Design a binder for this molecule. Structure first.
Ligand SMILES: [Mg+2]
Ligand SMILES: [Mg+2]
Ligand SMILES: [Mg+2]
Ligand SMILES: [Mg+2]
Ligand SMILES: [Mg+2]
Ligand SMILES: [Mg+2]
Ligand SMILES: [Mg+2]
Ligand SMILES: [Mg+2]
Ligand SMILES: [Mg+2]
Ligand SMILES: [Mg+2]
Ligand SMILES: [Mg+2]
Ligand SMILES: [Mg+2]
Ligand SMILES: [Mg+2]
Ligand SMILES: [Mg+2]
Ligand SMILES: [Mg+2]
Ligand SMILES: [Mg+2]
Ligand SMILES: [Mg+2]
Ligand SMILES: [Mg+2]
Ligand SMILES: [Mg+2]
Ligand SMILES: [Mg+2]
Ligand SMILES: [Mg+2]
Ligand SMILES: [Mg+2]
Ligand SMILES: [Mg+2]
Ligand SMILES: [Mg+2]
Ligand SMILES: [Mg+2]
Ligand SMILES: [Zn+2]
Lengths: 165, 73, 98, 51, 97
RNA sequence: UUAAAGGAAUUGACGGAAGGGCACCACCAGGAGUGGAGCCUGCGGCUUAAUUUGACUCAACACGGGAAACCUCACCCGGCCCGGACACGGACAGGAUUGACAGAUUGAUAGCUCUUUCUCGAUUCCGUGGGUGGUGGUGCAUGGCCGUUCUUAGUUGGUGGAGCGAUUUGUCUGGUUAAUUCCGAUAACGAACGAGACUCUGGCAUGCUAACUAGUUACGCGACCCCCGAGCGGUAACUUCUUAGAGGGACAAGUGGCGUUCAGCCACCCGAGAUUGAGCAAUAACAGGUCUGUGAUGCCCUUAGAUGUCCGGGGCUGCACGCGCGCUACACUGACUGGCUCAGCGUGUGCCUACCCUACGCCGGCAGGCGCGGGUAACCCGUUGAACCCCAUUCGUGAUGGGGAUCGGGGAUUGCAAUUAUUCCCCAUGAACGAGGAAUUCCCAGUAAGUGCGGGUCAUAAGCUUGCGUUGAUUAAGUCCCUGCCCU
């Protein structure tokens, strides 16, 4: 019985997309998380999670995806099973820089020092069809001062409109 | 900065509340080996005085669950 | 300080029914918004779930104001002690699937 | 127990942000609750571009 | 009876407009034109910085809300038949009888 | 007495050294100004219990979108709550574990404490360890973000030459351009980031695509006048006017001249334009700011009378002072009164959690109140009947009717509460100010400036800021003289 305007429903949907995507990249840092594609349908609210390692999404016995469905439905207000999640496999592991930094986080936590880890991820990204890559690591790196370690290979465009896509 | 909030205690070194009572609390009276005489006045029928009794005051009364005030000269 | 027994069985009954709990950060100081599922707003919910997140029973997540609570198979193995009170029923997360 | 006085139905304290409950910085009235710092990073996710 | 197609971006707008006109040409309905609406824009200006150092350097964030309306006098069964559309997710559909 | 003093040679940086170019954060010819007066808003210093703090040349000083009665609040005074998770363990109350009626004190009906004694009840209370919270310190530990070096065009590896070497050649004698932009020569070749190219806006146009949530032409319903078929307004076709979808249109193309074959430069016309304004913007750094935006974080500090959090007052607004950004005047090109007439961005409701846009009618002189309706929006505000501007009266060079600061009384609105801040309206009080010294800021065409409106905080709330409109200058289109930059 309530409604909101076109000038506010779009920014509410955008905050919904940002909320869902950033909370899934918060708590799903284990597997290879690329992004989500949420479709609009007045019968079933479809949420398509595109992931690299779909095993953590699908769970053991089909548990974690239904648990994420419950996480969405018990706050965002969609009863009677309105929200339905579908997982998609991403065959190109080295295509998503979000997934590459997501793997690099857990590789740099448990040992696997910065030099050899950067050479390994640059070798993997260069093997996975990419034309150019750049990894910048900043912070306390073998010293009390902050030394920005940059590792760049290939062809990288830094200026203009098509940088974002 | 270099500000400081320390202890001066101008007024009192006060403390909090701790409920202290006797060993047990008896409310009844033994008469004729089986008849109980009532000592304290009950509370009226407002879903309070089914098992809640009034506290002894000079002219006031008190419901424990519902805090009812009754006064008589 | 004693929570009512209806709340102390009801929040764990809701956790038994679903397994996913949701609250927010707003503890009572600007406003008193009651919970969309239960009666107590946030403080008794946090006091009930801190004993689960302290002993490693139910995991904790945060989405910009909101505490989400995450269920584990080991979480159900430790909540078996609460499962002694009903008959042995796996909640609607693990047993059945469509 | 007098827990909730000063009902806070107006002004600055009534504006509580969706991001980190920021209340010193302002919160815009656009159908939106951001902190003006994280809005820069999150505008490309919620649908705003620079042009 | 009117149908409003409100899109997020111009390419999906023109794709769903071309698909809807292509699906509406073959039927025996006097199909009105895809009436163009003025594009809405929510301009937001931001300080770019948490602390005030440097020049007054401001952001300019915008959206482009695009909208189209058509008029189709039809019975409700034919309207519900036309309603089933394989559609881009960036397009919202509203109907009014 | 000392661990260096030295020699060529390589790369920065510097030169009040030379050569070639660039820039209104530089100048010339100028325009508007500040610094003079009043006021607003910040900074330093004073005063206090506190007058919270960061930032100190561009690269701080209406900046923290920092417009505070408590809210924000981080600062002083008083008072409550533990949200003290959790492992062991003390009383274990033979079950009394924490909420309280009335009286004294305290703003409080705070069970804060005391007199008094009822109550949900194995959650308790306390100790030993750990944990949590902090707008506490540390940006000279940091991440992220921003600004600056630098809005100038510069930067780099692979192979191969020179040198033992740091390095250099590629990255240039010359011409040209906004450009390391290109042509050319060349111990270099093939390359890369950057500049351009990219995206949006503005300029022209289709009788292509279309419109009852936007209009036109005639036509009727239909009010008025001459009454002579005319003229102003209210209520079948296609997009010219409002909107954008595709495509086009502009590329120094055509002509003359200068230039080396070239690269390019100047004037014409067709054209709407012989190119507008923004965004993104390289390598490497500042020991630039932010721990006071984050449950972003390392170390230290406090954790029970709390540096955690609530409640009630004050404060950041306090002034013998100096400084910065701004608003209004110093009048006659004007001030007052009356009439006339024009817009564009953009905003608006029952919100992922408390809120507007207001039309019409009545009442009051006024700010305002009441009844009712529309708008979740090209529907209604709204054809935003806006200000300057276009005409008529009054004023007459007088600190004057310019200026409205200061101060007194009253009336309405939001808010629980405006008095040591709301805001607005009515009367009255009527200072300084006579176009501003030393010095200094911005700007080349719809440009500066005059003037008004929308958004941000908003509840009341703009003199700030971002954008939009109306009118719209003078004069350069050159230079490296002051300042600064790029390459030898
Ligand atoms: Mg860095
Ligand atoms: Mg020498
Ligand atoms: Mg000059
Ligand atoms: Mg001035
Ligand atoms: Mg001055
Ligand atoms: Mg002055
Ligand atoms: Mg400091
Ligand atoms: Mg904090
Ligand atoms: Mg620093
Ligand atoms: Mg830093
Ligand atoms: Mg420093
Ligand atoms: Mg740069
Ligand atoms: Mg050599
Ligand atoms: Mg070189
Ligand atoms: Mg047209
Ligand atoms: Mg922690
Ligand atoms: Mg202040
Ligand atoms: Mg001060
Ligand atoms: Mg300033
Ligand atoms: Mg006057
Ligand atoms: Mg006078
Ligand atoms: Mg003026
Ligand atoms: Mg408002
Ligand atoms: Mg305003
Ligand atoms: Mg301001
Ligand atoms: Zn926040």
């Amino acid at each position: 019985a309530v409604q909101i305007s076109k000038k506010r429903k779009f920014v509410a949907d955008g905050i919904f997309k940002a909320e869902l995507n950033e909370f899934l990249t918060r708590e799903l840092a284990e597997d290879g998380y690329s992004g989500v594609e949420v479709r609009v349908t007045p019968t079933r609210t479809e949420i398509i999670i595109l992931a690299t390692r779909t095993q953590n999404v699908l769970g053991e016995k089909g548990r974690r995806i239904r648990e994420l469905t419950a996480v969405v439905q018990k706050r965002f207000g969609f009863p009677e099973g309105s929200v339905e999640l579908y997982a998609e496999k991403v065959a190109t592991r080295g295509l998503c820089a979000i997934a590459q930094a997501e793997s690099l986080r857990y590789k740099l936590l448990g040992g696997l020092a910065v030099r050899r880890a950067c050479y390994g991820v640059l070798r993997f990204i260069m093997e996975s069809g990419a034309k150019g890559c750049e990894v910048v690591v900043s912070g306390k790196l073998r010293g009390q001062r902050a030394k920005s370690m940059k590792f760049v290979d290939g062809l990288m465009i830094h200026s203009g409109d098509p940088v974002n896509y | 900065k270099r500000k400081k909030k320390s202890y001066t205690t101008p007024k009192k070194n006060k403390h909090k509340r701790k409920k202290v009572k006797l060993a047990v609390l008896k409310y009844y009276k033994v008469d004729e080996n089986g008849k109980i005489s009532r000592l304290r006045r009950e509370c009226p029928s407002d879903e309070c005085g089914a098992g809640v009794f009034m506290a002894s005051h000079f002219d006031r009364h008190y419901c424990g669950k519902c805090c009812l005030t009754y006064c008589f000269n | 300080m004693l929570m009512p027994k209806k709340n102390r069985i009801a929040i764990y009954e809701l956790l038994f029914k679903e397994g996913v709990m949701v609250a927010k950060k707003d503890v009572h100081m600007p406003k008193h918004p009651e919970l969309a599922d239960k009666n107590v707003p946030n403080l008794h919910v946090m006091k009930a779930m801190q004993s689960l997140k302290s002993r490693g029973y139910v995991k904790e997540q945060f989405a910009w104001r909101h505490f989400y609570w995450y269920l584990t198979n080991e979480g159900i193995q430790y909540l078996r002690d609460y499962l002694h009170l009903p008959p042995e029923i796996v909640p609607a997360t693990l047993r059945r699937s469509r | 127990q007098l827990y909730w006085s000063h009902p806070r139905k107006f002004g600055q304290g009534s504006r509580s942000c969706r991001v980190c409950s920021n209340r010193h910085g302002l919160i815009r009235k656009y159908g939106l609750n951001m902190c003006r710092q994280c809005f820069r990073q999150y505008a490309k996710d919620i649908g705003f571009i620079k042009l | 009876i009117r149908i409003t197609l409100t899109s997020r971006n111009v390419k999906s707008l023109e794709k769903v407009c071309a698909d809807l006109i292509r699906g509406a040409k073959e039927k025996n309905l006097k199909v009105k034109g895809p009436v163009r609406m003025p594009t809405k824009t929510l301009r937001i200006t931001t300080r770019k910085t948490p602390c005030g150092e440097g020049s007054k350097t401001w952001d300019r964030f915008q959206m482009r809300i695009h909208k189209r309306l058509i008029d189709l006098h039809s019975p409700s069964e034919i309207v519900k038949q036309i309603t089933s559309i394989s559609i881009e997710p960036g397009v919202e559909v509203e109907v009014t009888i």
